[PDB]
Design an enzyme around this catalytic site. Sequence first.
Site, PDB file in Angstrom:
ATOM      1  N   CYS A  14      41.174  54.524 -52.197  1.00  0.00           N
ATOM      2  CA  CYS A  14      40.038  53.766 -51.718  1.00  0.00           C
ATOM      3  C   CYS A  14      39.159  53.292 -52.877  1.00  0.00           C
ATOM      4  O   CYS A  14      38.107  52.693 -52.648  1.00  0.00           O
ATOM      5  CB  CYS A  14      39.184  54.619 -50.767  1.00  0.00           C
ATOM      6  SG  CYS A  14      38.134  55.873 -51.576  1.00  0.00           S
ATOM      7  N   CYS A  17      37.801  57.399 -56.293  1.00  0.00           N
ATOM      8  CA  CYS A  17      38.058  58.231 -57.464  1.00  0.00           C
ATOM      9  C   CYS A  17      37.720  57.471 -58.766  1.00  0.00           C
ATOM     10  O   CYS A  17      37.232  58.054 -59.728  1.00  0.00           O
ATOM     11  CB  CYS A  17      39.505  58.727 -57.455  1.00  0.00           C
ATOM     12  SG  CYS A  17      39.805  60.034 -56.207  1.00  0.00           S
ATOM     13  N   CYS A 117      43.882  62.683 -52.130  1.00  0.00           N
ATOM     14  CA  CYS A 117      45.007  61.847 -51.714  1.00  0.00           C
ATOM     15  C   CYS A 117      46.180  62.049 -52.652  1.00  0.00           C
ATOM     16  O   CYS A 117      47.275  62.364 -52.207  1.00  0.00           O
ATOM     17  CB  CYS A 117      44.667  60.352 -51.673  1.00  0.00           C
ATOM     18  SG  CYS A 117      43.404  59.866 -50.481  1.00  0.00           S
ATOM     19  N   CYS A 155      37.255  64.537 -52.686  1.00  0.00           N
ATOM     20  CA  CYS A 155      37.269  63.264 -51.997  1.00  0.00           C
ATOM     21  C   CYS A 155      35.865  62.685 -51.925  1.00  0.00           C
ATOM     22  O   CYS A 155      35.233  62.706 -50.865  1.00  0.00           O
ATOM     23  CB  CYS A 155      37.880  63.448 -50.601  1.00  0.00           C
ATOM     24  SG  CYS A 155      38.359  61.875 -49.797  1.00  0.00           S
ATOM     25  N   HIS A 204      31.025  79.344 -50.995  1.00  0.00           N
ATOM     26  CA  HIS A 204      30.264  80.222 -50.125  1.00  0.00           C
ATOM     27  C   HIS A 204      29.727  81.468 -50.852  1.00  0.00           C
ATOM     28  O   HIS A 204      28.554  81.826 -50.725  1.00  0.00           O
ATOM     29  CB  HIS A 204      31.178  80.613 -48.970  1.00  0.00           C
ATOM     30  CG  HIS A 204      30.624  81.655 -48.052  1.00  0.00           C
ATOM     31  ND1 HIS A 204      29.676  81.377 -47.092  1.00  0.00           N
ATOM     32  CD2 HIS A 204      30.939  82.968 -47.903  1.00  0.00           C
ATOM     33  CE1 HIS A 204      29.409  82.478 -46.408  1.00  0.00           C
ATOM     34  NE2 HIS A 204      30.158  83.458 -46.884  1.00  0.00           N
ATOM     35  N   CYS A 207      26.797  80.610 -52.740  1.00  0.00           N
ATOM     36  CA  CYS A 207      25.894  79.696 -52.061  1.00  0.00           C
ATOM     37  C   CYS A 207      24.499  80.263 -51.969  1.00  0.00           C
ATOM     38  O   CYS A 207      24.331  81.446 -51.665  1.00  0.00           O
ATOM     39  CB  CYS A 207      26.379  79.440 -50.644  1.00  0.00           C
ATOM     40  SG  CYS A 207      25.358  78.234 -49.731  1.00  0.00           S
ATOM     41  N   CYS A 228      21.578  79.059 -42.710  1.00  0.00           N
ATOM     42  CA  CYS A 228      22.933  78.777 -43.145  1.00  0.00           C
ATOM     43  C   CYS A 228      23.524  77.647 -42.270  1.00  0.00           C
ATOM     44  O   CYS A 228      23.142  77.515 -41.091  1.00  0.00           O
ATOM     45  CB  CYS A 228      23.757  80.061 -43.066  1.00  0.00           C
ATOM     46  SG  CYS A 228      25.563  79.841 -43.062  1.00  0.00           S
ATOM     47  N   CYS A 234      29.895  73.955 -41.720  1.00  0.00           N
ATOM     48  CA  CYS A 234      30.106  74.164 -43.169  1.00  0.00           C
ATOM     49  C   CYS A 234      31.422  74.893 -43.458  1.00  0.00           C
ATOM     50  O   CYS A 234      31.691  75.966 -42.883  1.00  0.00           O
ATOM     51  CB  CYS A 234      28.938  74.959 -43.779  1.00  0.00           C
ATOM     52  SG  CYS A 234      29.041  75.045 -45.579  1.00  0.00           S
ATOM     53  N   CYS A 243      30.473  72.931 -56.931  1.00  0.00           N
ATOM     54  CA  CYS A 243      29.412  72.031 -56.478  1.00  0.00           C
ATOM     55  C   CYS A 243      28.057  72.727 -56.387  1.00  0.00           C
ATOM     56  O   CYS A 243      27.024  72.099 -56.597  1.00  0.00           O
ATOM     57  CB  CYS A 243      29.785  71.461 -55.100  1.00  0.00           C
ATOM     58  SG  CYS A 243      31.328  70.541 -55.191  1.00  0.00           S
ATOM     59  N   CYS A 255      26.411  68.587 -51.067  1.00  0.00           N
ATOM     60  CA  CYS A 255      26.735  68.496 -49.647  1.00  0.00           C
ATOM     61  C   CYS A 255      26.102  69.590 -48.774  1.00  0.00           C
ATOM     62  O   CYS A 255      25.684  69.322 -47.631  1.00  0.00           O
ATOM     63  CB  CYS A 255      28.245  68.525 -49.486  1.00  0.00           C
ATOM     64  SG  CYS A 255      29.081  67.312 -50.544  1.00  0.00           S
ATOM     65  N   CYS A 261      29.362  71.314 -46.210  1.00  0.00           N
ATOM     66  CA  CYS A 261      30.600  71.134 -46.978  1.00  0.00           C
ATOM     67  C   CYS A 261      31.747  70.850 -46.011  1.00  0.00           C
ATOM     68  O   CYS A 261      31.872  71.531 -44.975  1.00  0.00           O
ATOM     69  CB  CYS A 261      30.885  72.387 -47.809  1.00  0.00           C
ATOM     70  SG  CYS A 261      32.486  72.394 -48.729  1.00  0.00           S
ATOM     71  N   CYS A 264      36.484  69.243 -49.242  1.00  0.00           N
ATOM     72  CA  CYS A 264      37.219  68.020 -49.603  1.00  0.00           C
ATOM     73  C   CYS A 264      38.211  68.220 -50.753  1.00  0.00           C
ATOM     74  O   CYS A 264      39.078  67.379 -50.975  1.00  0.00           O
ATOM     75  CB  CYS A 264      36.235  66.910 -49.962  1.00  0.00           C
ATOM     76  SG  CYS A 264      35.383  67.082 -51.560  1.00  0.00           S
TER      77      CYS A 264
HETATM   78  S1  SF4 Z   1      25.731  77.122 -45.937  1.00  0.00           S
HETATM   79 FE1  SF4 Z   1      28.041  77.084 -45.991  1.00  0.00          FE
HETATM   80  S2  SF4 Z   1      28.666  77.890 -48.056  1.00  0.00           S
HETATM   81 FE2  SF4 Z   1      26.422  78.415 -47.702  1.00  0.00          FE
HETATM   82  S3  SF4 Z   1      26.332  80.558 -46.875  1.00  0.00           S
HETATM   83 FE3  SF4 Z   1      26.401  79.135 -45.071  1.00  0.00          FE
HETATM   84  S4  SF4 Z   1      28.623  78.802 -44.543  1.00  0.00           S
HETATM   85 FE4  SF4 Z   1      28.500  79.719 -46.659  1.00  0.00          FE
HETATM   86  S1  SF4 Z   2      40.727  61.257 -52.788  1.00  0.00           S
HETATM   87 FE1  SF4 Z   2      39.136  60.380 -51.378  1.00  0.00          FE
HETATM   88  S2  SF4 Z   2      37.811  59.209 -52.827  1.00  0.00           S
HETATM   89 FE2  SF4 Z   2      39.818  59.507 -53.939  1.00  0.00          FE
HETATM   90  S3  SF4 Z   2      41.231  57.732 -53.363  1.00  0.00           S
HETATM   91 FE3  SF4 Z   2      41.547  59.367 -51.730  1.00  0.00          FE
HETATM   92  S4  SF4 Z   2      40.136  58.776 -50.017  1.00  0.00           S
HETATM   93 FE4  SF4 Z   2      39.395  57.761 -51.917  1.00  0.00          FE
HETATM   94  S1  SF4 Z   3      32.565  68.613 -49.460  1.00  0.00           S
HETATM   95 FE1  SF4 Z   3      32.329  70.737 -50.377  1.00  0.00          FE
HETATM   96  S2  SF4 Z   3      33.902  70.770 -52.071  1.00  0.00           S
HETATM   97 FE2  SF4 Z   3      33.612  68.547 -51.491  1.00  0.00          FE
HETATM   98  S3  SF4 Z   3      32.029  67.832 -52.972  1.00  0.00           S
HETATM   99 FE3  SF4 Z   3      30.925  68.536 -51.093  1.00  0.00          FE
HETATM  100  S4  SF4 Z   3      30.312  70.716 -51.477  1.00  0.00           S
HETATM  101 FE4  SF4 Z   3      31.901  70.125 -53.017  1.00  0.00          FE
END
Ligand code: SF4
Ligand code: SF4
Ligand code: SF4
Lengths: 279, 481
Positions: A14, A17, A117, A155, A204, A207, A228, A234, A243, A255, A261, A264
């Site tokens: 897409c 990246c 991907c 992603c 987590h 976190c 949470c 999540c 992250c 995220c 989250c 991804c």
């Molecule tokens: S927000 Fe998500 S990563 Fe953070 S403690 Fe809760 S479930 Fe775990």
């Molecule tokens: S991994 Fe996600 S951001 Fe990267 S080419 Fe695939 S769909 Fe797009």
């Molecule tokens: S979806 Fe989760 S692993 Fe992906 S960038 Fe966001 S916090 Fe990081």
Amino acid sequence: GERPPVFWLQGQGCTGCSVTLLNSVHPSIADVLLKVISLEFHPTVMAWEGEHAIEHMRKVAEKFKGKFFLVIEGSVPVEADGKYCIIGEANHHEISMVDALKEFGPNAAAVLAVGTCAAYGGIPAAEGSETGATAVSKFLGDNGIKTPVVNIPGCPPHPDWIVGTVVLALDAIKKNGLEGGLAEVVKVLDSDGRPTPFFGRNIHENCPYLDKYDEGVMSATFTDKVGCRYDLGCKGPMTMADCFERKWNGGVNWCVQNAVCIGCVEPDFPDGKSPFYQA
Amino acid sequence: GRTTIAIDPVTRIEGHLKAEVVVENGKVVDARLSGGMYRGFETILRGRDPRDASQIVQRICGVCPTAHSTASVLALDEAFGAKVPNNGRITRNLIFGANYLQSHILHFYHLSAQDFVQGPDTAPFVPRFPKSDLRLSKELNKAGVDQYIEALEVRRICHEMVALFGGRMPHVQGQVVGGATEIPTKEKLVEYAARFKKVRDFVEQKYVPVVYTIGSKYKDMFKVGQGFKAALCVGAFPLDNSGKKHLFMPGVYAKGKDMPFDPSKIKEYVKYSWFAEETTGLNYKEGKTIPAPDKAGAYSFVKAPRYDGLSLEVGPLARMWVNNPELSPVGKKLLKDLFGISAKKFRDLGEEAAFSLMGRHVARAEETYYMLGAIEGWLKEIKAGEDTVVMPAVPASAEGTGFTEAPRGSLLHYVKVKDSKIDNYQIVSASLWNCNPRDDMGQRGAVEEALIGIPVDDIQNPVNVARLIRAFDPXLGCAVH
Ligand code: SF4
Ligand code: SF4
Ligand code: SF4
Ligand code: FCO
Ligand SMILES: [Fe+2]
Ligand code: NI
Ligand SMILES: [S]
């Protein structure tokens, strides 16, 4: 020193990246392009076009046989004789993504599968698809191509994971030479082919909301930032990425703070991480 | 003689495009555009929790993911009967508006500018055509390069703006059915505004002036690329909660006439597209996506949308023409100084110059300037601390449509929900309108038609073919999905 040549091939991607890489802060993308790598082919940003662009890549590939890095963005679709992804035309022949990876993959120093991907199949390989979208490592293995593969999923991935993995490789190569250096890189990959400096830690367990999770204090609306996010969907518990520390886009958010989250960077994204908004 | 030139890949666009033109006596006399990559989001989406769509659809395109996010959440809002709080509406506009800035700046500098500017002697700026028709003086060329470099920082700052309330970018987390996931705090609004100020300075002082200035060295490029001279706008950026006023109001322009937009008149043809013949001619509410990659005669994975039979274009030119706003102060000044043109509103450029290769670059710069005012307005309107989201249950049976304007043009998403899952999801995107092939009656798509007449005085260096294509800021990921 001499910047290594890089060819960046887009399959069923897409362009996210590529865009995420443009967001690199330290070093800036300008410094990456001018001082770190020599980006010889990239369809989104290169000067030349068409058959001339393909032939330039071919000339560089021959000159640097075994020495260039091949980045793949997007999955590789194998159905219908590769026709779901045509990447170029040269010598009056169409070149599919299948053809391209078979041509350049065997002669690369290493293949960097950038994004979920390319790494794992991702959204194009998800339930309901019908293009035979295939991950880079599986495709290479299925075709007897033994070139080392490093997965940098997400992603999109964070730019630091992409640039950082390139730098990991360059440091190892400076110390050990090309083959030896790439062997040292492969030793720091986890069982999913991901570099442990970026993917060796769990979201987590690191976190800031973990204490709330343990107390069973869960947000019932997205805009409640005290609780949470587990009941909102999540997927932090099942996700290996840093992250929580580096955050996103110059550290302005991430995220879990903003929403949830969605896991991804994981091999089963998206289907194994869906539905996104329920536990 | 007749010269066929195939360009695959067309570079410095998004996604996979082959252009094939026929040149006779130094001019393009026919054209075919082929979108060469398919993923099939419309089938991948089926069977899922509908709330998932607003994440899944973003992966159509990592340059314009906020546009798909927006269309999806609007469609889901309608299907769910979700009542987005006023403050959530404004927050969504701040998220999406910031990417308009990113996308237009990316497009002009990092995709288009090398059409006119010679970069440094290193990849990926060399090699290139031996005769690239690069006309700028040493000084102006260096300004182009310096601004390309500065623009890399500025577009990145635009994505910091997006992420402040959007979570991250590409692929925001912050827009969902029911509003926006994060209430803006006073502190983060200060951060947004500080970044916005830098972007505004760059747009006003560098970007808009350089487009006119480069344009003035390529005045011939305002005399080609007209095509059908027909445009579509479906409306975008709701300015109240009543749904009555938008920053860009909808409308259609064709054969010199303005008319209202009626979405029931959209049909998608597939004769020359790699889809099953029996799916031709469908309105999106009854759309179907059945790939046929071996179908005889077809040459693209892009369907052919027509509006009441018309082949239309979309994008900044379309919106700016339909809405006809006042020109930027910079534009007014440089139109006079560099072109000898006296103009106050966008349409004062005249139809021929506006619907031209360089006209479309001008429209995109002007629109970027216009968006600055919109974002400034939203930063005044937004209220720190006020809730931005509701949490609606998933319906068992529902449908909804979201309409908006992506940076590249008109976008709609349609969803039908059955048994609490996506039963059908159809997407009609911006570059679908621009980069499509012939319809069932053989009428060309907008860019195909705009190629007719393009000068190719040197078939060994046919630079104007891709220059015309890039003026439309094509996105083949969006076009095909
Ligand atoms: S927000 Fe998500 S990563 Fe953070 S403690 Fe809760 S479930 Fe775990
Ligand atoms: S991994 Fe996600 S951001 Fe990267 S080419 Fe695939 S769909 Fe797009
Ligand atoms: S979806 Fe989760 S692993 Fe992906 S960038 Fe966001 S916090 Fe990081
Ligand atoms: N902008 C953008 Fe993407 C395209 N074309 C959408 O919609
Ligand atoms: Fe579609
Ligand atoms: Ni797009
Ligand atoms: S966007």
